[PDB]
Amino acid sequence: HHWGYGKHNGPEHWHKDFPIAKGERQSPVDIDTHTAKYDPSLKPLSVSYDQATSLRILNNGWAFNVEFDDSQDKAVLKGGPLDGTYRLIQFHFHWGSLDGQGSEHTVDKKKYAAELHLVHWNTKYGDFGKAVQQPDGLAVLGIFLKVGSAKPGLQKVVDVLDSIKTKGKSADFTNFDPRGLLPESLDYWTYPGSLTTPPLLECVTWIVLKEPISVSSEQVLKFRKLNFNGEGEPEELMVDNWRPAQPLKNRQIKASFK
Ligand SMILES: [Zn+2]
Numbered sequence: 001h002h003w004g005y006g007k008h009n010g011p012e013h014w015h016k017d018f019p020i021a022k023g024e025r026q027s028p029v030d031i032d033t034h035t036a037k038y039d040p041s042l043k044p045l046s047v048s049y050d051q052a053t054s055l056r057i058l059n060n061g062w063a064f065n066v067e068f069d070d071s072q073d074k075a076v077l078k079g080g081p082l083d084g085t086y087r088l089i090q091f092h093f094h095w096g097s098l099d100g101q102g103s104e105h106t107v108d109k110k111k112y113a114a115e116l117h118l119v120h121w122n123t124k125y126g127d128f129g130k131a132v133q134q135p136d137g138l139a140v141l142g143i144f145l146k147v148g149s150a151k152p153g154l155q156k157v158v159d160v161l162d163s164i165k166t167k168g169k170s171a172d173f174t175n176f177d178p179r180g181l182l183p184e185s186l187d188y189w190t191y192p193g194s195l196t197t198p199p200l201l202e203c204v205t206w207i208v209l210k211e212p213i214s215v216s217s218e219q220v221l222k223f224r225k226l227n228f229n230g231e232g233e234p235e236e237l238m239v240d241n242w243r244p245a246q247p248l249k250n251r252q253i254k255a256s257f258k
Contacts, residue, residue, distance in 0.1 A: 003198050004062075004228065011243045018200050025202045026246040027193030028104035031253055036189055039254035045080035045186050045207070047141070052088060054176035057160055061167035061228055062197060063092040063241055066157065066176060070121070070128070075178070077120045077139050080207060080256065081190045086120035086139040089128055091178060093117070094196075095223045097239035099147045104196050104242045105208050107144075112212055113220055114145035115242070116181060117196075132195070132203045142208040143183065150216035153180020158222045167230040183211040187257040196243045210257065 003014050015021035052075035057066045067090045068075060075088035095114035096102030103112035118141040121131040131137030145151075156176055163171045187210040194202040226238035 005241050014198055014200065018198050020194070020200050020202065023194065023200070023202055024249050025192050025194060025251060026200065026249075027196050027204060027206060028106070028243060028245055029191065029193065029248050029251075029253070030106045030109055030245040031189050031208065033108050036253040036255045038258050039081075039190075039256070042081055042190070042254065042256050043079045045188065045256065046076075046078040047182065047186065048078070049075045049088065049177070049179045051075060052176075052178055054173050054178075056170050057157070057164060057173035058170035059164040059167055059226060059238075061230070063094065063238070064161070064164060064226065065090045065092045066173055066178075073123065076123075077118075077141060077207075080188065081205060081254070082139055082207075083136075085123045087123055088118060088120050088178070091116060091118040091181075093145070093223065094242040095145070095220060095239065096242065097224065097237070099217075099220070101240065102242055103144055104245075105142055105144075105206075106245050112144040113147050114215075114223070116143040116145060116213075117141070118143075118178065132201050134203055135192070136205060137203040138195075139205045139207060142206065143181065144209070144212035145215050145220070146212045147217050147220060148214035150219055151181070151213055153177065154215055154219055158219050161222050161226060165225070165231075166227045166233075169231070181213065183209060183213045185209070185211045187211065187255075189253050189255050191251055191253040193251075 053069040103115040125131040
């Protein structure tokens, strides 16, 4: 019996094994666009994914991760509210059972169909494991997904989902370009937060882009064909694998724009 997104092991139950779930800087949160203040101190955001090297995609029973080789600086996130260099290690999504829900962060209480998380770790800490134990160990770039026109750059991911339908399955996923999942604008909100899945460590600086990316109903539908369960077990569709907005507490969300 471990955490999940069901009625008996969902987000509302996590605090029993991970007390920090009721912490002071938990994620996700609702982004109140009218309360978020433009911050002149924020430097230009730098997303350098030209040399990104994907290696594999796996269904870990919670979502599916596209993993990258982070043994060198090839795909890094810099600038903005960040100091130093954060290296891309993996990206995954959260999505709903219906188009009206799925995202973890919300904008003026609006829920998007899904949310993409590109996870990067601070190189000053040597590795991902050491980084998550630091308040500024991770930077996560969040991007909202809405249903509309298809996203060409996401199809490659959609095409391999059939091969990793159940928990534990992985497949070769080399030469995938994450630049194809980015919206036109890099305007963003930023605040100090946590991982949104157990162990919910508060080591995340959050950078959530204002502009969502459009994906086709067909693309999202394939996401919903994945399974939380392992092969040969009763089918539980992998849907609504998102954590709800958490108390903002003593935090301020800063905007990179006006
Ligand atoms: Zn996530």
